[PDB]
């Protein structure tokens, strides 16, 4: 329970399925891109059967009429998603199914609604808006559906300012649904750190949910509840985005090519694929553990075959092996993928981490103070044996470590260190509110001390949100840097204390741990971070350039 996926499912099931569920009969469900991702997120597509769904189809693709079954339209308020519906009841007026049951993932504009109401049913026995416009990526991490948000959020200043406002409200209203699903009416507090986007957004959200609840028909929540929403801009921590993190999940999506949470084989023959989801429950116990601790907590070997191979429990060991043929089949996948990472590690990543941690901390490796840090960066130049990706990442740390660098010295690097093309992977970081040419700036923030224990002496770096999460739970947080019988009562449960965090421009898998580790160390409240997307070092760099060019 509580797992973000569950909460969403618990809502969809009672808001949608139960709402149009007739015990004796089943119906056809239609989904667009988003809703498909939404459902795939929090349920096996078989669980639907118990909910009154016998057939699911793509509302986009033309379909065969079934004028005997009722139709459940679970879609977003998208022009495309709605046009397709109107192509089932509106145009040609040639009805496709007995009746229609429309459930919009979010509020539906009058423009589209008008086109719906007018034409032409009748058949439309229901048009309901449930307000779920986010993806329960993990049981504590969410991600919105705001295409090309990052770009338009940190674009130079061309005609890409009208579309930036578009992305802003999209994020705002999309974030609001996150609250509404948790049944929380938080207090919006931004950061006064880089740029000022988080403040503008914090205003859109604060206003957005002031209108929401003022109209919410669920009637559960009205007036602020015991939870606070933090909106922070990406500039606040450029470091953690670039670090070659060592915790399993953050290192896999970084090193290996794991597009769409699906890591591809071998092994073996032929090459299949595996999915890194929470239904695995094995990868859930490992995705946040350090690479070494990972291996030494499930690997070699429970062998030779446990206590096999006088046999009183002979049949027991015969049946116990039949079902255990899957526990090993899964332990293998989460081991091969672990190998593919272990390799890239011993090959050069290991050496790359040595001088990265000492630079990101600038005083790590016991070397207090350090002084000349450009001496620390050197190693990663002849150890290449490297990719221009790792090279830029290392330099980025150096600059972040010495804040605003010089204009001339920076130039020499982009020359006598190759990195000719893809040079903007360093330049454009200034658009995110991080000094690139002007020395100093805000002279850096102030983070927590200890620095207690830190095995491996490589991942001694802690993302700045963890010091923010605790700075929120422990209450101690700068108010200037983080603005804003009878009786009656207004009961009551359940939700309780929740810390909702939302970083703009994406979150790292290393920052995701922070949510778990902090909420796991605590219990009096659950931290919940999110964004428009999840970040990987490379994908970030790619996105971080291209900024100075209006697409095209």
């Amino acid at each position: 329970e509580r797992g973000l996926k569950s909460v969403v499912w618990r809502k969809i099931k009672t808001a949608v399925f139960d709402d149009c569920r007739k015990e004796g009969e089943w119906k056809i469900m239609l989904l667009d891109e988003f809703t498909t991702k939404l459902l795939s997120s929090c349920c096996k597509m078989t669980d639907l059967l118990e909910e009154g769904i016998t057939v699911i189809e793509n509302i986009y693709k033309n379909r065969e009429p079934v004028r005997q079954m009722k139709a459940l339209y679970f879609i977003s308020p998208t022009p495309k998603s709605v046009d397709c519906f109107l192509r089932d009841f509106g145009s040609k007026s040639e009805k496709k199914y007995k009746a229609a049951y429309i459930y919009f993932t979010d509020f539906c504009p009058d423009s589209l609604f008008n086109k719906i109401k007018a034409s032409c049913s009748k058949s439309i026995r229901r048009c309901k808006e449930i307000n779920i416009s986010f993806i329960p990526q993990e049981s504590q991490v969410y991600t919105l559906d705001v295409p090309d948000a990052f770009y338009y959020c940190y674009s130079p200043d061309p005609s890409n300012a009208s579309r930036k406002e578009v992305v802003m409200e999209a994020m705002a209203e999309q974030i609001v649904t996150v609250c509404a699903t948790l049944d929380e009416n938080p207090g919006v507090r931004y950061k006064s750190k880089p740029l000022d986007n988080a403040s503008k957004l914090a205003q859109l959200v604060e206003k957005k949910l002031e209108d929401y609840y003022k109209i919410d028909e669920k009637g559960l929540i009205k007036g602020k509840t015991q939870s606070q929403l933090l909106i922070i801009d990406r500039g606040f921590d450029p470091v953690s985005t670039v670090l070659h993190e060592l915790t399993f999940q953050a290192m896999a999506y970084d090193l290996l090519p794991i597009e769409n949470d699906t890591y591809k084989y071998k092994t073996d023959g032929k090459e299949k694929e595996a999915v890194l989801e929470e239904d695995d429950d094995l990868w859930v116990r490992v995705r946040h553990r350090h690479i070494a601790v990972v291996l030494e907590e499930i690997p070699k070997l429970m062998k030779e075959i446990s206590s096999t191979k006088s046999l009183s429990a002979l049949t027991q060991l015969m049946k116990k092996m039949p079902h255990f043929r899957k526990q090993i089949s899964k332990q293998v996948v989460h081991l091969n993928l672990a190998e593919d990472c272990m390799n890239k590690f011993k090959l050069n990543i290991e050496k790359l981490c040595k001088t990265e941690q000492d630079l990101a901390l600038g005083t790590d490796a016991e070397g207090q103070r350090v002084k000349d840090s450009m001496l620390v960066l050197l190693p990663v130049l002849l150890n290449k044996n490297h990719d221009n990706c790792d090279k830029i990442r290392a330099v980025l740390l150096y600059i972040f470590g010495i804040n605003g660098t010089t204009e001339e010295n920076l130039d020499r690097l982009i020359h006598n260190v190759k990195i000719e093309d893809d040079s903007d992977m360093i330049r454009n970081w200034s658009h995110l509110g991080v000094p690139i040419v002007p020395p100093s700036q805000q002279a850096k923030p102030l983070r927590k001390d200890r620095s207690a224990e830190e095995t491996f002496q490589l991942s001694r770096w802690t993302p700045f949100i963890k010091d923010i999460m605790e700075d929120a739970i422990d209450n101690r947080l700068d108010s200037k840097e983080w603005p804003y019988r009878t009786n009656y009562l207004e009961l009551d449960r359940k939700n309780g204390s929740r810390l909702i965090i939302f970083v703009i421009g994406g979150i790292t898998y290393s920052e995701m741990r922070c949510a778990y580790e902090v909420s796991q160390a605590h219990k009096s409240c659950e931290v919940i971070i999110g964004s428009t997307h999840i970040l990987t070092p490379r994908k970030l760099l790619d996105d971080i350039k291209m900024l100075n060019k209006s697409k095209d």
Binding site: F113, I116, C127, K128, I130, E217
Partner: peptide, 9 residues
């Protein structure tokens, strides 16, 4: 609004 069914008719 959250339930527009009535609004259709």
């Amino acid at each position: 609004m959250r339930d527009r069914t009535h609004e259709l008719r």
